[PDB]
Structures are given as structure tokens and as C-alpha cells.
Design a protein around this ligand. Structure first.
Ligand code: HEM
Ligand SMILES: O=C(O)c1coc2c1C(=O)CCC2
Length: 394
């Protein structure tokens, strides 16, 4: 006898396990056990992943209900799981989205200048360099301080909460509450700080004093700062890191992009498609009995949408493991989700990766791993897949 198949299958972000294509072909929705001991339905084909993400009866908000089957323990208060819904209910969706676009004057030049300064510091120090801790994560942190309007020097202490805040744990995490409460106090101070007049926190601080928002709560204003810093920094730093691995392991493509940087946006869209940064399927709770493939999912059951199941589906992306810059459907991957909860930071995340890669290819055209790939240490029990260090030479 064996126990029911457990998820996740592997914390490695440099290879997709053979189980995924096997499930997708044989059982594109099938029952699994999560780290809490709950059962769930794992969806692994592009068709069924899009069906679930486009049907709001598979609810994000209801995953926070007491008693529900859980993917992992909450690391924020339950009402924060409905963060974007709360932002939309407060009439703040358009304002938040405007503040986090990469189109703000000078923002791209600030990202380029920051990437070039970090790279020059590594070149001065000499190989090996760690492109996660001393390049992709400080570039994500500096970008998000600039986008929020908060001091660059406050980035590193907010960042250090993230290796706990974005854990994927079977049990509640006492340090996540200590850091959450501290980071909320900091964002509440930022709203009262007269020096903060730009970016998303300067805009929320002005709307807070406008009569059209006088009953929006101070807890929501501070929550938007902590959640958008943390989601944006963990997601862009982790995606850039694992995209640099995929590029370093494809020297022919790396040389193509170095030679013709105008192809970097199409290369980044393929590195999104093949990215294994999300460590778990996206969770949803059924609010009705709904047929998905050969399974009748029942109200109250947990469904997990495996993004790499969709993104490596050869029925939708033929030769799925290959980066091909001339696909006819290049932005139809699920790396930013789909439907009601599609990522609000998608443009910013694409621009962070494009500028980081352009800068790295110009400054370190011979970049390569400095250790054998199997020596990278993959973080476990985390909502992203990331190597703890990414040692390179050039
Ligand atoms: C390459 C970088 C990024 C990737 C791959 C990414 C991926 C995703 C995915 C897959 C979702 C959907 C989750 C779901 O449906 O359950 C999502 C939602 C979210 N993302 Fe991103 N993200 C990125 C960058 C950003 C940035 C830069 C921000 C903010 C500055 C951001 C903030 C959020 C928020 C707040 C949500 C929740 C939306 C909702 O619930 O409606 N992300 N992201
Ligand atoms: O912002 C966090 O610290 C956070 C860390 O983990 C999550 C969040 C969310 O706000 C969304 C639910 C998952």
C-alpha cells in the first residue's frame, strides 16, 4: 500500500518533475494531500487550470474560512486574504494600479542605474558573485522602495521579514505575526510622515485625508503598503533569480539576447512561461458543486491550480520546455494568473526582469554558474522556489 500523492512534488526551480506531464496526460485533475494533511484537487492541464481561474465560484477569499481544507497555514490575518477585494471595495483599485505601473517618469532610469551600480560593485569585488542576494533581491527591494515612496534605507529591514512571511507551513508561524505587526506599524507611521509624498504610500497618504475616503480604515491603508511591498519584492526577486538560471543554462539564447537586446521582452515573456517560481498550486475553495474534467468538485473542497502544469502543456505550447521567441500565443501563459485575481503588478514585474537582464548581459556578457547546478540549495516549505545563493563568475 502507499499513501495518497503529496504536494508539492519538488522544491527545485531548475527542472520540472516527470510526474507533472504524467498527471497532465492521465489525470489532469486528481486528488492529492497537502502539507497540512488536507485533501485537495490538483489541476495540471492548461484547459482545466484556466477553467478554475476564470470561474469565481472557485473562490480565493473562501480559502481563509475557519474549518476549510488548507494548502498551508495563514501568515496574515484572514481578512487580508481578500486584500484586493478590500482595496476594490474601498474605491482604491485604480489608484493602486496607477501607482505601481513601470511608466512613472524616471522609474525605468532609476532601475537601470540601480542594476548597473549593483553589477559594478560585484565586478569590483571579483568573482564569485551571488546574483540572488547581491543583485536580484536588492534590485527588487530598491524598486519597491521607489514605487512605494519610502526611504531606500528602510528596504533591507522590510525585506528581512519575507523569508518567514512567504513561508508555506503546515502550522501557524509565531515570527510571521511579530514581523507583520511591526511592518504594519511602520506603514502606519509612513502614512503620518509628512516627508512621504511620492509613490503608492504618498498617494494613499493623500487619499486618506480626502473626504471621499474618510471611512476607509487606517488598517487597510497600512495593509496595502505591507502586502504590495512583500508580494512585489518576493515575486520579482524570485522570478528574476530563477530566470537568470534559465538563461545561464541556455548559452545560445543568452548570446542571442546579448547581441540583439530588442528581443529581451520576448525572451522575458518565455522565461515567465517556463518559470517555476511558484512553489504550490494557486488555492481556491469551491463555493458550489462544479464539474472539472472527469471530477465533480464539491462545495467546500480545495482546488490547487498548478501554474507549470498549464505553462508546460504541449497542447497549448508545443515544445513546452524550449524557449522560442516567435510563438503566436506568447502572453497566454499563466505566470501572472488569470481572471479575477490576475496579478496587479504584472507590468512592473516584466519591466524589473527586462531591465535586470539587459543590464546583466551588457556588464557580464560571459556570466556563467560558478558551481555545478546541482549544488544550488533550494529553499523548502516556502511559497516560492529559490536558490539560497546563486554563485556566478564571468
Ligand atoms: C514576475 C513577478 C510576479 C509574478 C510572477 C507574480 C505572480 C502572481 C500570480 C500568479 C498571482 C495570482 C495569485 C492568484 O490568483 O491566487 C499574483 C497576484 C498578486 N500579485 Fe503578483 N507577481 C509578480 C509581481 C508582482 C508585483 C511587482 C506586485 C506588486 C508590486 C504584485 C502583487 C500581487 C498582488 C497584490 C496579488 C493578489 C491579487 C488578487 O488577489 O487579486 N505581484 N501575482
Ligand atoms: O503579505 C504577506 O505577508 C503575505 C505573505 O503570504 C501571503 C501574504 C498575503 O498578503 C496574501 C496571502 C499570502
Amino acid at each position: 500500500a502507499t499513501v495518497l500523492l503529496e504536494v508539492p512534488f519538488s522544491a527545485r526551480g531548475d527542472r520540472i518533475p516527470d510526474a507533472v506531464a504524467e498527471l497532465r496526460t492521465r489525470e489532469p485533475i486528481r486528488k492529492v494531500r497537502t502539507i497540512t494533511g488536507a485533501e485537495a484537487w490538483l489541476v495540471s492541464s492548461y484547459a482545466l487550470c484556466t477553467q478554475v481561474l476564470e470561474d469565481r465560484r472557485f473562490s480565493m477569499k473562501e480559502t481563509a474560512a475557519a474549518g476549510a481544507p488548507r494548502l498551508n497555514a495563514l501568515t496574515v490575518p484572514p481578512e487580508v486574504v481578500n486584500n484586493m477585494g478590500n482595496i476594490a471595495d474601498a474605491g482604491l483599485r485604480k489608484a493602486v494600479m496607477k501607482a505601481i505601473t513601470p511608466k512613472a517618469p524616471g522609474l525605468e532610469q532609476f532601475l537601470r542605474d540601480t542594476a548597473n551600480s549593483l553589477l559594478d560593485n560585484l565586478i569590483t569585488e571579483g568573482a564569485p558573485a551571488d546574483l540572488r542576494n547581491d543583485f536580484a533581491d536588492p534590485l527588487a527591494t530598491a524598486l519597491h522602495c521607489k514605487v512605494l515612496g519610502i526611504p531606500q534605507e528602510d528596504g533591507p529591514k522590510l525585506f528581512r521579514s519575507l523569508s518567514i512571511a512567504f513561508m508555506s507551513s503546515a502550522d501557524p508561524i509565531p515570527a510571521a505575526k511579530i514581523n507583520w505587526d511591526r511592518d504594519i506599524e511602520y506603514m502606519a507611521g509612513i502614512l503620518e510622515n509628512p516627508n512621504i509624498t511620492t509613490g503608492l504610500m504618498g498617494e494613499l497618504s493623500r487619499l486618506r485625508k480626502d473626504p471621499a475616503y474618510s471611512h476607509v480604515s487606517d488598517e487597510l491603508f497600512a495593509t496595502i503598503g505591507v502586502t504590495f511591498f512583500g508580494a512585489g519584492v518576493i515575486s520579482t526577486g524570485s522570478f528574476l533569480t530563477t530566470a537568470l538560471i534559465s538563461l545561464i543554462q541556455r548559452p545560445q539564447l543568452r548570446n542571442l539576447l546579448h547581441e540583439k537586446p530588442e528581443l529581451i521582452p520576448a525572451g522575458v515573456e518565455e522565461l515567465l512561461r517556463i518559470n517555476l517560481s511558484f512553489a504550490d498550486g494557486l488555492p481556491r475553495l469551491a463555493t458550489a458543486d462544479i464539474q472539472v474534467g472527469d471530477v465533480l468538485v464539491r462545495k467546500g473542497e480545495l482546488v490547487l491550480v498548478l501554474l507549470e502544469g498549464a505553462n508546460f502543456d504541449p497542447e497549448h505550447f508545443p515544445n513546452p520546455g524550449s524557449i522560442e521567441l516567435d510563438r503566436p500565443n506568447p502572453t497566454s501563459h499563466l505566470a501572472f494568473g488569470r481572471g479575477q485575481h490576475f496579478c496587479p503588478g504584472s507590468a512592473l514585474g516584466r519591466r524589473h526582469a527586462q531591465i535586470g537582464i539587459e543590464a546583466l548581459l551588457k556588464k557580464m556578457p560571459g556570466v556563467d554558474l560558478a558551481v555545478p547546478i546541482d549544488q544550488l540549495v533550494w529553499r523548502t516549505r516556502f511559497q516560492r522556489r529559490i536558490p539560497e545563493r546563486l554563485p556566478v563568475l564571468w
